[PDB]
Amino acid sequence: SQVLKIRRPDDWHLHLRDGDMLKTVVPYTSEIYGRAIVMPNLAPPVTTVEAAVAYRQRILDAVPAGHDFTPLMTCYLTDSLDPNELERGFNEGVFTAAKLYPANAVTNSSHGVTSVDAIMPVLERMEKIGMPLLVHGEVTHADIDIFDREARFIESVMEPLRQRLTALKVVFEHITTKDAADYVRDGNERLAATITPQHLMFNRNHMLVGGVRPHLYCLPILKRNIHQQALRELVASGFNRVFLGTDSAPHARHRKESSCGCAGCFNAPTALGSYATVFEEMNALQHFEAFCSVNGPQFYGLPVNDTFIELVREEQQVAESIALTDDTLVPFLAGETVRWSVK
Amino acid sequence: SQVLKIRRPDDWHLHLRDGDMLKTVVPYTSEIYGRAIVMPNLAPPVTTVEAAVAYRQRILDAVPAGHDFTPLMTCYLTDSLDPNELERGFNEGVFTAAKLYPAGVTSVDAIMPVLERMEKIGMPLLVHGEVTHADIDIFDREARFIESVMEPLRQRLTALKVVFEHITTKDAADYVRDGNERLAATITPQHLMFNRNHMLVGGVRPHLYCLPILKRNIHQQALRELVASGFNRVFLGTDSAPHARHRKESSCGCAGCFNAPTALGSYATVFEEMNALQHFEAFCSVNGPQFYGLPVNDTFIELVREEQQVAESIALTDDTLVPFLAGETVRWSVK
Numbered sequence A: 001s002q003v004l005k006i007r008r009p010d011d012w013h014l015h016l017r018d019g020d021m022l023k024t025v026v027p028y029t030s031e032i033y034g035r036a037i038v039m040p041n042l043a044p045p046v047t048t049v050e051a052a053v054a055y056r057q058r059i060l061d062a063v064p065a066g067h068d069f070t071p072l073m074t075c076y077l078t079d080s081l082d083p084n085e086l087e088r089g090f091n092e093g094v095f096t097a098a099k100l101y102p103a104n105a106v107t108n109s110s111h112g113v114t115s116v117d118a119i120m121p122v123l124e125r126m127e128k129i130g131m132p133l134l135v136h137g138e139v140t141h142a143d144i145d146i147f148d149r150e151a152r153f154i155e156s157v158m159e160p161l162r163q164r165l166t167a168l169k170v171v172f173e174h175i176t177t178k179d180a181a182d183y184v185r186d187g188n189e190r191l192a193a194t195i196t197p198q199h200l201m202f203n204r205n206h207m208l209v210g211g212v213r214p215h216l217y218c219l220p221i222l223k224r225n226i227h228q229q230a231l232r233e234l235v236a237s238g239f240n241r242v243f244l245g246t247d248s249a250p251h252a253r254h255r256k257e258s259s260c261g262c263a264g265c266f267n268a269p270t271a272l273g274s275y276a277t278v279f280e281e282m283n284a285l286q287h288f289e290a291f292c293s294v295n296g297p298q299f300y301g302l303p304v305n306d307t308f309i310e311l312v313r314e315e316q317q318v319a320e321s322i323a324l325t326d327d328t329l330v331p332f333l334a335g336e337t338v339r340w341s342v343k
Numbered sequence B: 001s002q003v004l005k006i007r008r009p010d011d012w013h014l015h016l017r018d019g020d021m022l023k024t025v026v027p028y029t030s031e032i033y034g035r036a037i038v039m040p041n042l043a044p045p046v047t048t049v050e051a052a053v054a055y056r057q058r059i060l061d062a063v064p065a066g067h068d069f070t071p072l073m074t075c076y077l078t079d080s081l082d083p084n085e086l087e088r089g090f091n092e093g094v095f096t097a098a099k100l101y102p103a104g105v106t107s108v109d110a111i112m113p114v115l116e117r118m119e120k121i122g123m124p125l126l127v128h129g130e131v132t133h134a135d136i137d138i139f140d141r142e143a144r145f146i147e148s149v150m151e152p153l154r155q156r157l158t159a160l161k162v163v164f165e166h167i168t169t170k171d172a173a174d175y176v177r178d179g180n181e182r183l184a185a186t187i188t189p190q191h192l193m194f195n196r197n198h199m200l201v202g203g204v205r206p207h208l209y210c211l212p213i214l215k216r217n218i219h220q221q222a223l224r225e226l227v228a229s230g231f232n233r234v235f236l237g238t239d240s241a242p243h244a245r246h247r248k249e250s251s252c253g254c255a256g257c258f259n260a261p262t263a264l265g266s267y268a269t270v271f272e273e274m275n276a277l278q279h280f281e282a283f284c285s286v287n288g289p290q291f292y293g294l295p296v297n298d299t300f301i302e303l304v305r306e307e308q309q310v311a312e313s314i315a316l317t318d319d320t321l322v323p324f325l326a327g328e329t330v331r332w333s334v335k
């Protein structure tokens, strides 16, 4: 059976949650990835240096003995965040980046951003100091169709922001459209993107035809096939400012399979082999290592890992579920036979 | 305070299921509607007169004393169905119409002799109008059906009476509006009240997941304008399609809204919002009978504009049933 050896990868977009759930999910990441960008959308969010320090330690506490894993912390951008607090966290190595979630005029100032214009002092500071901005690029106005929200963000927010702050480094997280693929392809060295395995492997038909499948329900929402194909083409092209970001985003089974299912795929356990499957199908395995292990480091100005891992092209069954203290997690591709697994 | 008195309505598109489910759900229809078109997608489907007769009696068995409700039975069209069986059931007063589900039927070409018979005898054809090829995006399946199946069919069988069931697009709305007297449509409450955002923003809501899939807002608006205009070949058809809670709320949720308990008031709210209450009775109680060549009901009911809370769930023998709009407050109630 065929082997693919790559420099140890990193995950440039990860949700690890907290408490018991954190304890359950960390190992799926730490066994494989050297570093991950740990997102700050805890309840309450990580908006201070002290919280990020404490959260980093809880994550390290949960890493199994012998895994060489380093969490890269982020600050949740809010209206009330002091730019001095963000700067101090960056300067002390606590915050690797800051994350901007969709604006909403009714958000509490302690929990989010009302408008992008309103946090310009903090954004100017990030530009000044060279701190990268990670963007969940959707506009969430009630009158905008959910499938249009990413495209609308490019026009309304992304392009004006980058024109306003010409030195700002930005990762367009988990892109899902041809709109975003083209935009990123056509950008400068200060614009990059991450892509999840689900947005490469599936489109909205997989989530809605024959049944509604809440384990494929995630934001930004799966788009039509033309968008899926654009994403696949982009990673297959060798374009070097797209990189691995799983957006592994675990929710208990009962919170997924409910009257109002939570958004997010728990894909940490199966992401890497899923990406290998996509690059192989695209006859583009020569660009697979760079996607997983080189492009992200280069954009963040961090070293490439100097250890290796091996994927083997031998069929394996994915677990149907993974136990939590209470309830269970259903992994991405649960119960399926997958083509590539880690040796 | 405000009271609205209408001729008793009918439901021209209903799923009653079978067994204990049927027992549970029939009363929500029989208490209000004089008649309903009972769809034939049982497992196995109703494809013979004999099965239709038996099913009709199970339905009648489950109707509470004092409800004057008549189920109008339908035949599930199959590639192989004998035209003589379908005609016999029509002639015996058993089959009111036949229903075309897309593969269901593999092609309209395979069932031509059945369709030609329906045309000759005056039997309406009820169409679930979606193409199903795996590669066609789910949101495009209705519009694609119009071009590739509906319009060719109608041009070939010019005398055939067709109801375009549960339409969900401006495409279909425009098509029906511009059609002749042999084409009509039903519209559900969900496709008037909501669009796909309501199913997908803030969470995935499987109780709003149904086929044809909820579409974007411009399509919702087209349907609302269609009913509100007074156009007289669109009529009430709930597509009440109940599934146990944990078949809805699962890793692969079933399609269908259990809307029988709340549909009528929900429609009232829509027409009221569209400033079109003067057309509400015809949609509910006149347009269908006229298309089907059946008399209008000779009794009347009243809706009052008093806010009722919808039950969170309805008990079944096993599991529960979550009604459409569960836990929400509805603006109009049946007095």
Ligand SMILES: NC(=O)N[C@@H](CC(=O)O)C(=O)O
Residues within 6 Å of the ligand: B015, B041, B128, B209, B210, B211, B212, B239, B241, B242, B255, B256, B257
């Ligand atoms: N529409 C649905 O979502 N469900 C209906 C089938 C139908 O009307 O196609 C059902 O029978 O469950």
Ligand SMILES: O=C1C[C@@H](C(=O)O)NC(=O)N1
Residues within 6 Å of the ligand: A015, A041, A136, A217, A218, A219, A220, A247, A249, A250, A263, A264, A265
């Ligand atoms: O933006 C997001 C948030 C994430 C989560 O659950 O944290 N889940 C998602 O599906 N995408």
Ligand SMILES: [Zn+2]
Residues within 6 Å of the ligand: A136, A173, A174, A219, A220
């Ligand atoms: Zn996000």
Ligand SMILES: [Zn+2]
Residues within 6 Å of the ligand: A013, A014, A015, A039, A247, A249
């Ligand atoms: Zn995320």
Ligand SMILES: [Zn+2]
Residues within 6 Å of the ligand: B128, B165, B166, B211, B212
């Ligand atoms: Zn249907």
Ligand SMILES: [Zn+2]
Residues within 6 Å of the ligand: B013, B014, B015, B039, B239, B241
């Ligand atoms: Zn139906």
